Protein backbone atom coordinates (compact mmCIF):
# COMPACT_ATOMS: atom_id res chain seq x y z
CA UNK A 1 0.00 0.00 0.00
CA UNK A 2 1.49 3.31 -1.13
CA UNK A 3 0.98 5.89 1.63
CA UNK A 4 0.87 9.51 0.46
CA UNK A 5 1.19 12.01 3.31
CA UNK A 6 0.77 15.79 3.29
CA UNK A 7 1.86 17.87 6.29
CA UNK A 8 0.93 21.45 7.14
CA UNK A 9 0.96 23.56 10.30
CA UNK A 10 1.43 27.22 11.24
CA UNK A 11 5.18 27.86 11.22
CA UNK A 12 5.17 31.39 12.65
CA UNK A 13 6.30 30.68 16.22
CA UNK A 14 9.74 29.29 17.04
CA UNK A 15 8.18 26.41 18.99
CA UNK A 16 6.07 25.62 15.93
CA UNK A 17 9.15 25.56 13.70
CA UNK A 18 10.98 23.29 16.15
CA UNK A 19 7.95 20.98 16.25
CA UNK A 20 7.89 20.96 12.44
CA UNK A 21 11.56 19.98 12.29
CA UNK A 22 11.00 17.26 14.89
CA UNK A 23 7.99 15.85 13.03
CA UNK A 24 9.86 15.91 9.71
CA UNK A 25 12.83 14.10 11.25
CA UNK A 26 10.39 11.57 12.69
CA UNK A 27 8.89 11.04 9.23
CA UNK A 28 12.35 10.51 7.73
CA UNK A 29 13.27 8.08 10.51
CA UNK A 30 10.12 6.04 9.80
CA UNK A 31 11.02 5.50 6.14
CA UNK A 32 9.10 8.35 4.52
CA UNK A 33 10.72 10.28 1.65
CA UNK A 34 10.01 13.94 0.92
CA UNK A 35 9.16 14.52 -2.74
CA UNK A 36 8.58 18.24 -2.18
CA UNK A 37 7.54 20.68 0.53
CA UNK A 38 4.74 19.14 2.63
CA UNK A 39 4.74 16.17 0.22
CA UNK A 40 5.89 12.75 1.45
CA UNK A 41 5.24 9.07 0.78
CA UNK A 42 6.14 5.66 2.20
CA UNK A 43 5.62 2.07 1.07
CA UNK A 44 3.77 0.03 3.70
CA UNK A 45 4.12 -3.74 3.55
CA UNK A 46 0.52 -4.63 4.47
CA UNK A 47 -2.62 -3.34 6.16
CA UNK A 48 -1.38 -4.08 9.69
CA UNK A 49 1.76 -1.97 9.23
CA UNK A 50 -0.47 0.70 7.69
CA UNK A 51 -2.75 0.79 10.74
CA UNK A 52 0.19 0.86 13.16
CA UNK A 53 1.70 3.66 11.07
CA UNK A 54 -1.58 5.57 11.28
CA UNK A 55 -1.62 5.27 15.06
CA UNK A 56 2.02 6.33 15.30
CA UNK A 57 1.38 9.33 13.03
CA UNK A 58 -1.58 10.35 15.19
CA UNK A 59 0.62 10.04 18.28
CA UNK A 60 3.50 12.06 16.80
CA UNK A 61 1.38 14.81 15.23
CA UNK A 62 2.41 18.23 16.60
CA UNK A 63 0.03 20.77 18.08
CA UNK A 64 -1.83 22.57 15.26
CA UNK A 65 -0.39 19.94 12.92
CA UNK A 66 -2.47 18.60 10.04
CA UNK A 67 -1.62 15.43 8.11
CA UNK A 68 -3.48 14.05 5.10
CA UNK A 69 -3.05 10.32 4.43
CA UNK A 70 -4.15 8.70 1.18
CA UNK A 71 -3.75 5.13 -0.09
CA UNK A 72 -2.45 4.71 -3.64
CA UNK A 73 -1.42 1.89 -5.97
CA UNK A 74 1.94 1.70 -7.73
CA UNK A 75 0.24 2.53 -11.03
CA UNK A 76 -1.23 5.70 -9.54
CA UNK A 77 2.09 6.50 -7.86
CA UNK A 78 3.92 6.30 -11.20
CA UNK A 79 1.18 8.51 -12.66
CA UNK A 80 1.94 11.20 -10.07
CA UNK A 81 2.77 14.47 -11.84
CA UNK A 82 4.61 17.37 -10.19
CA UNK A 83 4.48 20.80 -11.83
CA UNK A 84 6.86 23.52 -10.61
CA UNK A 85 6.23 27.02 -11.96
CA UNK A 86 7.74 22.60 -15.61
CA UNK A 87 5.67 19.45 -15.07
CA UNK A 88 6.65 15.85 -14.38
CA UNK A 89 7.58 13.66 -17.34
CA UNK A 90 5.68 10.59 -16.11
CA UNK A 91 2.31 12.16 -16.94
CA UNK A 92 3.59 13.10 -20.40
CA UNK A 93 2.77 10.75 -23.28
CA UNK A 94 5.78 11.97 -25.29
CA UNK A 95 7.36 9.25 -27.42
CA UNK A 96 11.03 10.22 -26.96
CA UNK A 97 12.37 10.94 -23.47
CA UNK A 98 15.79 12.51 -22.87
CA UNK A 99 17.64 12.19 -19.57
CA UNK A 100 20.70 14.06 -20.71
CA UNK A 101 21.12 17.05 -23.02
CA UNK A 102 17.73 17.90 -24.52
CA UNK A 103 19.62 19.59 -27.40
Amino acid sequence: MRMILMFDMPTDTAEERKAYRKFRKFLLSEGFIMHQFSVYSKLLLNHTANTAMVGRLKANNPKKGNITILTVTEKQFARMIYLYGNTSIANSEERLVFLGDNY
Binding site: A90, R95, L96, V97, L99, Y103
Partner: protein, 287 residues
Protein backbone atom coordinates in the same frame (compact mmCIF):
# COMPACT_ATOMS: atom_id res chain seq x y z
CA UNK B 1 6.61 0.25 -25.77
CA UNK B 2 6.04 3.65 -27.37
CA UNK B 3 8.92 5.51 -25.68
CA UNK B 4 12.61 5.83 -26.54
CA UNK B 5 14.51 6.67 -23.34
CA UNK B 6 18.01 8.09 -23.84
CA UNK B 7 20.32 8.33 -20.82
CA UNK B 8 23.34 10.59 -21.34
CA UNK B 9 23.90 11.24 -17.62
CA UNK B 10 25.66 9.26 -14.91
CA UNK B 11 23.17 7.40 -12.70
CA UNK B 12 22.16 3.96 -11.44
CA UNK B 13 19.32 1.93 -12.95
CA UNK B 14 17.36 -0.72 -11.04
CA UNK B 15 14.21 -2.77 -11.61
CA UNK B 16 11.43 -2.52 -9.01
CA UNK B 17 7.78 -3.60 -9.26
CA UNK B 18 7.73 -3.81 -13.07
CA UNK B 19 9.15 -0.28 -13.05
CA UNK B 20 12.45 1.09 -14.33
CA UNK B 21 14.08 2.99 -11.46
CA UNK B 22 16.42 5.85 -12.37
CA UNK B 23 18.39 6.78 -9.25
CA UNK B 24 20.70 9.81 -9.15
CA UNK B 25 21.97 12.16 -6.47
CA UNK B 26 19.91 15.09 -7.77
CA UNK B 27 16.62 13.30 -8.45
CA UNK B 28 15.00 9.90 -8.89
CA UNK B 29 12.37 8.99 -11.48
CA UNK B 30 10.41 5.81 -12.20
CA UNK B 31 9.25 4.90 -15.71
CA UNK B 32 7.04 1.90 -16.45
CA UNK B 33 8.49 -0.82 -18.67
CA UNK B 34 5.36 -1.38 -20.78
CA UNK B 35 5.59 2.17 -22.15
CA UNK B 36 9.30 1.83 -22.97
CA UNK B 37 10.21 0.63 -26.47
CA UNK B 38 13.94 1.38 -26.81
CA UNK B 39 16.56 2.05 -24.13
CA UNK B 40 19.67 3.97 -25.21
CA UNK B 41 22.73 4.51 -23.01
CA UNK B 42 24.81 7.32 -24.52
CA UNK B 43 27.55 7.45 -21.86
CA UNK B 44 29.92 5.05 -20.11
CA UNK B 45 29.14 6.30 -16.58
CA UNK B 46 25.70 4.65 -16.41
CA UNK B 47 25.24 1.70 -14.05
CA UNK B 48 22.68 -1.08 -14.48
CA UNK B 49 21.69 -4.37 -12.84
CA UNK B 50 21.56 -7.79 -14.49
CA UNK B 51 18.04 -8.25 -13.10
CA UNK B 52 16.91 -5.16 -15.01
CA UNK B 53 18.64 -6.60 -18.08
CA UNK B 54 16.71 -9.85 -17.64
CA UNK B 55 13.45 -7.91 -17.25
CA UNK B 56 14.35 -5.99 -20.42
CA UNK B 57 14.97 -9.26 -22.27
CA UNK B 58 11.61 -10.62 -21.10
CA UNK B 59 9.97 -7.32 -22.08
CA UNK B 60 11.72 -7.50 -25.50
CA UNK B 61 13.15 -3.98 -25.19
CA UNK B 62 16.16 -3.08 -27.33
CA UNK B 63 19.12 -1.99 -25.20
CA UNK B 64 21.86 0.01 -26.94
CA UNK B 65 25.26 0.74 -25.38
CA UNK B 66 27.31 3.62 -26.79
CA UNK B 67 30.93 4.71 -26.38
CA UNK B 68 32.59 7.73 -24.78
CA UNK B 69 32.18 9.47 -28.15
CA UNK B 70 28.42 8.67 -27.74
CA UNK B 71 28.47 6.56 -30.92
CA UNK B 72 26.69 3.21 -30.40
CA UNK B 73 29.04 0.39 -29.41
CA UNK B 74 27.09 -2.82 -28.77
CA UNK B 75 23.42 -3.75 -28.42
CA UNK B 76 21.83 -6.62 -26.51
CA UNK B 77 20.51 -9.52 -28.59
CA UNK B 78 18.17 -12.00 -26.86
CA UNK B 79 18.69 -15.67 -27.63
CA UNK B 80 14.99 -16.63 -27.72
CA UNK B 81 12.46 -13.87 -28.35
CA UNK B 82 9.60 -16.29 -29.07
CA UNK B 83 9.08 -20.02 -29.45
CA UNK B 84 8.35 -19.56 -33.17
CA UNK B 85 12.04 -18.83 -33.82
CA UNK B 86 13.14 -22.47 -33.58
CA UNK B 87 10.38 -23.38 -36.04
CA UNK B 88 11.31 -20.46 -38.31
CA UNK B 89 14.97 -21.55 -38.55
CA UNK B 90 13.95 -24.61 -40.57
CA UNK B 91 11.99 -22.36 -42.94
CA UNK B 92 14.96 -20.00 -43.31
CA UNK B 93 17.15 -22.99 -44.17
CA UNK B 94 14.44 -24.09 -46.62
CA UNK B 95 14.29 -20.70 -48.37
CA UNK B 96 14.92 -20.53 -52.11
CA UNK B 97 17.37 -18.33 -54.00
CA UNK B 98 14.56 -17.24 -56.34
CA UNK B 99 12.49 -15.93 -53.42
CA UNK B 100 15.52 -14.26 -51.84
CA UNK B 101 16.66 -12.59 -55.07
CA UNK B 102 13.06 -11.66 -55.92
CA UNK B 103 12.25 -10.09 -52.55
CA UNK B 104 15.66 -8.38 -52.41
CA UNK B 105 15.22 -7.09 -55.96
CA UNK B 106 11.78 -5.69 -55.12
CA UNK B 107 13.19 -4.09 -51.96
CA UNK B 108 16.02 -2.46 -53.92
CA UNK B 109 13.42 -1.26 -56.42
CA UNK B 110 11.49 0.28 -53.52
CA UNK B 111 14.65 2.00 -52.27
CA UNK B 112 15.58 3.43 -55.67
CA UNK B 113 11.95 4.45 -56.18
CA UNK B 114 12.09 6.17 -52.78
CA UNK B 115 15.22 8.04 -53.88
CA UNK B 116 13.53 9.15 -57.11
CA UNK B 117 10.56 10.25 -54.98
CA UNK B 118 12.86 12.00 -52.50
CA UNK B 119 14.77 14.02 -55.12
CA UNK B 120 11.51 14.41 -56.98
CA UNK B 121 10.19 16.14 -53.86
CA UNK B 122 13.71 17.58 -53.57
CA UNK B 123 12.98 17.94 -57.27
CA UNK B 124 16.07 17.31 -59.58
CA UNK B 125 16.27 15.78 -63.08
CA UNK B 126 19.37 13.62 -63.68
CA UNK B 127 19.63 12.77 -60.00
CA UNK B 128 15.94 12.06 -59.54
CA UNK B 129 14.53 10.37 -62.60
CA UNK B 130 17.93 9.19 -63.74
CA UNK B 131 17.57 7.18 -60.58
CA UNK B 132 14.02 6.33 -61.74
CA UNK B 133 15.62 5.14 -65.00
CA UNK B 134 18.06 3.01 -63.01
CA UNK B 135 14.96 1.71 -61.21
CA UNK B 136 13.35 0.63 -64.48
CA UNK B 137 16.71 -0.92 -65.42
CA UNK B 138 17.15 -3.01 -62.26
CA UNK B 139 17.45 -6.74 -62.92
CA UNK B 140 18.07 -9.95 -61.00
CA UNK B 141 21.60 -10.68 -59.72
CA UNK B 142 22.31 -6.95 -60.22
CA UNK B 143 24.80 -7.23 -63.11
CA UNK B 144 24.73 -3.47 -63.82
CA UNK B 145 25.08 -2.37 -60.16
CA UNK B 146 22.32 0.20 -60.66
CA UNK B 147 21.83 0.33 -56.88
CA UNK B 148 25.39 1.46 -56.22
CA UNK B 149 25.18 3.85 -59.16
CA UNK B 150 21.90 5.20 -57.79
CA UNK B 151 23.58 5.75 -54.42
CA UNK B 152 26.64 7.44 -55.95
CA UNK B 153 24.48 9.72 -58.11
CA UNK B 154 22.17 10.33 -55.15
CA UNK B 155 24.85 11.47 -52.70
CA UNK B 156 26.88 13.19 -55.43
CA UNK B 157 23.81 15.13 -56.56
CA UNK B 158 22.65 16.00 -53.04
CA UNK B 159 25.96 16.94 -51.39
CA UNK B 160 27.93 17.95 -54.49
CA UNK B 161 30.25 16.20 -56.91
CA UNK B 162 33.23 16.58 -54.58
CA UNK B 163 31.35 14.66 -51.88
CA UNK B 164 31.87 10.93 -51.41
CA UNK B 165 30.70 8.16 -49.10
CA UNK B 166 34.29 7.33 -48.09
CA UNK B 167 34.89 10.79 -46.60
CA UNK B 168 35.38 11.30 -42.87
CA UNK B 169 33.16 14.41 -42.77
CA UNK B 170 30.35 14.73 -40.23
CA UNK B 171 27.86 14.18 -43.07
CA UNK B 172 29.03 10.59 -43.59
CA UNK B 173 29.37 10.25 -39.81
CA UNK B 174 25.71 11.20 -39.33
CA UNK B 175 24.76 8.91 -42.22
CA UNK B 176 26.52 5.98 -40.57
CA UNK B 177 24.93 6.97 -37.25
CA UNK B 178 21.40 6.94 -38.65
CA UNK B 179 22.18 3.72 -40.51
CA UNK B 180 23.39 2.26 -37.20
CA UNK B 181 20.23 3.27 -35.33
CA UNK B 182 17.87 2.10 -38.07
CA UNK B 183 20.01 -1.03 -38.41
CA UNK B 184 19.61 -1.59 -34.66
CA UNK B 185 15.82 -1.23 -34.78
CA UNK B 186 15.51 -3.41 -37.89
CA UNK B 187 17.88 -5.96 -36.35
CA UNK B 188 15.73 -6.03 -33.21
CA UNK B 189 12.66 -6.58 -35.40
CA UNK B 190 14.45 -9.47 -37.12
CA UNK B 191 15.19 -10.84 -33.64
CA UNK B 192 11.46 -10.57 -32.91
CA UNK B 193 10.71 -12.53 -36.08
CA UNK B 194 13.22 -15.17 -34.97
CA UNK B 195 14.96 -15.75 -38.31
CA UNK B 196 18.74 -15.69 -38.54
CA UNK B 197 20.05 -12.15 -38.99
CA UNK B 198 23.39 -13.28 -40.45
CA UNK B 199 21.76 -14.81 -43.56
CA UNK B 200 21.25 -12.22 -46.29
CA UNK B 201 18.76 -12.24 -49.16
CA UNK B 202 21.20 -10.85 -51.77
CA UNK B 203 24.74 -12.29 -51.64
CA UNK B 204 25.38 -15.64 -49.96
CA UNK B 205 29.14 -15.01 -50.12
CA UNK B 206 29.05 -11.93 -47.88
CA UNK B 207 28.86 -13.03 -44.23
CA UNK B 208 27.63 -10.35 -41.83
CA UNK B 209 25.20 -10.39 -38.91
CA UNK B 210 23.62 -7.10 -40.07
CA UNK B 211 23.20 -8.14 -43.73
CA UNK B 212 19.52 -9.12 -43.50
CA UNK B 213 18.57 -6.13 -41.35
CA UNK B 214 20.39 -3.90 -43.84
CA UNK B 215 18.47 -5.42 -46.76
CA UNK B 216 15.25 -4.75 -44.85
CA UNK B 217 16.39 -1.23 -43.89
CA UNK B 218 17.42 -0.25 -47.43
CA UNK B 219 14.15 1.54 -48.39
CA UNK B 220 14.18 3.79 -45.29
CA UNK B 221 17.62 5.38 -45.88
CA UNK B 222 16.24 8.41 -47.79
CA UNK B 223 14.31 9.44 -44.66
CA UNK B 224 17.68 9.88 -42.94
CA UNK B 225 19.13 11.49 -46.07
CA UNK B 226 16.45 14.20 -45.94
CA UNK B 227 17.16 15.39 -42.39
CA UNK B 228 20.89 14.99 -43.04
CA UNK B 229 20.49 17.21 -46.10
CA UNK B 230 18.52 19.87 -44.21
CA UNK B 231 20.73 19.94 -41.10
CA UNK B 232 24.04 19.48 -42.96
CA UNK B 233 25.00 23.07 -42.08
CA UNK B 234 24.21 22.52 -38.40
CA UNK B 235 26.70 21.02 -35.96
CA UNK B 236 26.90 17.26 -35.51
CA UNK B 237 25.17 17.52 -32.12
CA UNK B 238 22.11 19.29 -33.54
CA UNK B 239 22.15 16.85 -36.46
CA UNK B 240 22.09 13.96 -33.99
CA UNK B 241 19.17 15.65 -32.22
CA UNK B 242 17.24 16.01 -35.48
CA UNK B 243 18.04 12.34 -36.11
CA UNK B 244 16.50 11.58 -32.70
CA UNK B 245 13.39 13.55 -33.71
CA UNK B 246 12.66 10.89 -36.35
CA UNK B 247 11.30 8.62 -33.62
CA UNK B 248 8.86 11.35 -32.56
CA UNK B 249 7.82 12.17 -36.13
CA UNK B 250 5.25 10.04 -37.95
CA UNK B 251 5.27 8.77 -41.53
CA UNK B 252 2.45 7.82 -43.90
CA UNK B 253 2.20 4.10 -44.62
CA UNK B 254 0.13 2.91 -47.57
CA UNK B 255 -2.63 1.95 -45.13
CA UNK B 256 -2.53 5.03 -42.88
CA UNK B 257 -0.17 7.35 -41.01
CA UNK B 258 1.85 5.41 -38.42
CA UNK B 259 4.97 5.71 -36.29
CA UNK B 260 8.35 4.56 -37.59
CA UNK B 261 8.56 1.64 -35.15
CA UNK B 262 5.13 0.32 -36.16
CA UNK B 263 5.97 0.69 -39.86
CA UNK B 264 9.23 -1.21 -39.35
CA UNK B 265 7.52 -3.94 -37.32
CA UNK B 266 4.63 -4.44 -39.75
CA UNK B 267 6.98 -4.17 -42.73
CA UNK B 268 9.32 -6.82 -41.31
CA UNK B 269 6.31 -9.00 -40.50
CA UNK B 270 5.02 -8.76 -44.07
CA UNK B 271 8.55 -9.45 -45.36
CA UNK B 272 8.94 -12.60 -43.24
CA UNK B 273 5.43 -13.77 -44.12
CA UNK B 274 6.17 -13.14 -47.80
CA UNK B 275 9.42 -15.11 -47.54
CA UNK B 276 7.74 -18.08 -45.85
CA UNK B 277 4.76 -17.97 -48.24
CA UNK B 278 7.02 -17.41 -51.30
CA UNK B 279 6.09 -13.89 -52.33
CA UNK B 280 2.37 -13.58 -51.64
CA UNK B 281 2.54 -9.79 -51.27
CA UNK B 282 5.47 -7.36 -51.17
CA UNK B 283 5.09 -4.42 -48.74
CA UNK B 284 5.84 -1.08 -50.40
CA UNK B 285 6.88 2.01 -48.43
CA UNK B 286 6.80 5.43 -50.09
CA UNK B 287 7.74 8.86 -48.76
Amino acid sequence: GWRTVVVNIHSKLSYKNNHLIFRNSYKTEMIHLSEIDILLLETTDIVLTTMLVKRLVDENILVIFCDDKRLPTAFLTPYYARHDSSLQIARQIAWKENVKCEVWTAIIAQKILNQSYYLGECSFFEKSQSIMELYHGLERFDPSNREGHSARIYFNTLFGNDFTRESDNDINAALDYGYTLLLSMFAREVVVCGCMTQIGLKHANQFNQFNLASDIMEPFRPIIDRIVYQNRHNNFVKIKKELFSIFSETYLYNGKEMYLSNIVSDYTKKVIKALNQLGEEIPEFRI
